Amino acid sequence: GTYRKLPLFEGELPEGSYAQIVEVKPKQTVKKHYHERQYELFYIISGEARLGIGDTEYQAKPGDIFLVKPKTVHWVVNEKDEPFRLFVVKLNYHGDDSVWL
Amino acid sequence: MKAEIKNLIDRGTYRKLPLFEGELPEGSYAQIVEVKPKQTVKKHYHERQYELFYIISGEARLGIGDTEYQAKPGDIFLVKPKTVHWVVNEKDEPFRLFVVKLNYHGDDSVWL
Ligand SMILES: [Zn+2]
Ligand SMILES: [Zn+2]
Ligand SMILES: [Zn+2]
């Protein structure tokens, strides 16, 4: 819902590890949230978006890499017809922890 | 937050560029890997670390256990531990990939 979520290497990734593509549907926004304990590593694959982490908003283009440490708030705004697609890795992942602002 | 590649580590057959050093949790690491033109990375296995590859640019015969893919941009891979991998760069282009290491408690790398 809101953005797609395409897990890879399911059951193959060590304890607390996780990897997946996500696809932020076009001209949609992902709302302010944070993770209690998990890290997000992004590699921006295609499209363009506004990406906030803590106190900084980036104009995320492909080939950018981002880190979201925990208790750090993030959002994306896609203002493009093309979907925003990113490679995600989650570190110290204890399952679902998204506290949604 | 954003990745600024300002640190190069040179291993001759290639170069490794770490990312977010100190920022990542224990057992984690992330880095770009540049396999310099016409070069190969020789057969090698990792004690326990896992290596997730996202292939950024170029083509290089990539070999994980028994399957040699031709790693193009957009491919994703995993090299579970105790798995023999290597890379032959074919082009006059760097073969570049975003790597994360999982279960990395320092250099578990070993080479055949
Ligand atoms: Zn997110
Ligand atoms: Zn390796
Ligand atoms: Zn694969």
Numbering used by the authors:
A (entry chain G): 12 to 112
B (entry chain A): 1 to 112
Published text:
To investigate protein HHP adaptation, Elastic Incoherent Neutron Scattering (EINS) and Quasi-Elastic Neutron Scattering (QENS) have been employed to study the dynamics of two orthologous proteins from T. barophilus (Tba) and T. kodakarensis (Tko), which only differ by their optimal growth pressure. X-ray crystallography was performed to obtain the structures of the proteins. Both present very similar features: their structure is dominated by β-sheet contributions with turns and disordered regions connecting them, forming a jelly-roll barrel structure, and both present a dimeric quaternary structure. The active site is located in a pocket inside the barrel and is conserved between the two proteins (His44, His46, Glu51 and His85). The two orthologs differ at 16 positions, and most of the substitutions are located at the protein–water interface and involve mainly polar and charged residues, with the notable exceptions of I35V, located in the hydrophobic core of the protein, and I100V, located at the monomer–monomer interface.
Interestingly, the catalytic metal ion coordinated by these four residues is found to be magnesium in Tba PMI and zinc in Tko PMI; however, the structure’s resolution does not allow for making a definitive assignment, as the Van der Waals radius of both ions is smaller than the resolution. Tko PMI crystals were obtained after one week from condition E8 of the Structure screen 1 + 2 kit (Molecular Dimensions), containing 0.2 M ammonium phosphate monobasic, 0.1 M Tris pH 8.5, and 50% v/v MPD. Tba PMI crystals belong to the I222 space group and contain one molecule in the asymmetric unit, while Tko PMI crystals belong to the P31 space group and contain eight molecules in the asymmetric unit. After model building using Coot and Refine from the Phenix package (Tba PMI) or REFMAC5 (Tko PMI), the final structures exhibited an R(%)/R(%)free of 0.18/0.20 at 1.7 Å (Tba PMI) and 0.23/0.29 at 2.2 Å (Tko PMI). Hence, our data indicate that the extent of compression of the protein hydrophobic core is larger in Tko PMI than in Tba PMI, presumably due to the presence of bigger cavities in the former. The appearance of VFT behaviour on such a fast time-scale is intriguing, and it shows that side-chain relaxations are strongly coupled to hydration water dynamics in Tko PMI. It appears that Tko PMI’s dynamics are dominated by cooperative motions and that high pressure can destabilize them, as highlighted by the increase in fragility (i.e., decreasing D) with increasing pressure, while Tba PMI’s dynamics are dominated by pressure-insensitive activated processes. On the other hand, the temperature dependence of Tko PMI appears to be stronger, and a sizeable increase in the confinement radius is detected with increasing pressure.
